[PDB]
Amino acid sequence: MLQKKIEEIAAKYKHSVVKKCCYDGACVNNDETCEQRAARISLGPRCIKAFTECCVVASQLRA
């Protein structure tokens, strides 16, 4: 559309993994430790790490 929406769109595609793998990683789960949950991941390290970091961090902020 107009020159910001442009970037607005193309951003959507940058670091897509980190972006996502992080979100799930943060999203609450008190039935499982991060470790357990990250074991179930199938998208390899980047996602894995991503996911983890965010989880652990978030949780701790939940403290």
3-state DSSP call for residue 4? helix
Domain that holds residue 61: 1-63
Resolution to 1 decimal place, in Å: 3.3
Which run of H or of E encompasses 60? helix 44-62
Question: 13: domain CATH number?
Answer: 1.20.91.20
Nearest CA among 10, 14, 23 for reference residue 50: 23
Residue type, 34: C
C-alpha neighbours within 13 Å on the C-beta side of residue 48: 10
Task: Give the method used.
Answer: X-ray
Residue type, 20: K
Number of compact structural domains in the chain: 1
Within its chain, how far is the Cα of 57 from the centroid?
A: 11
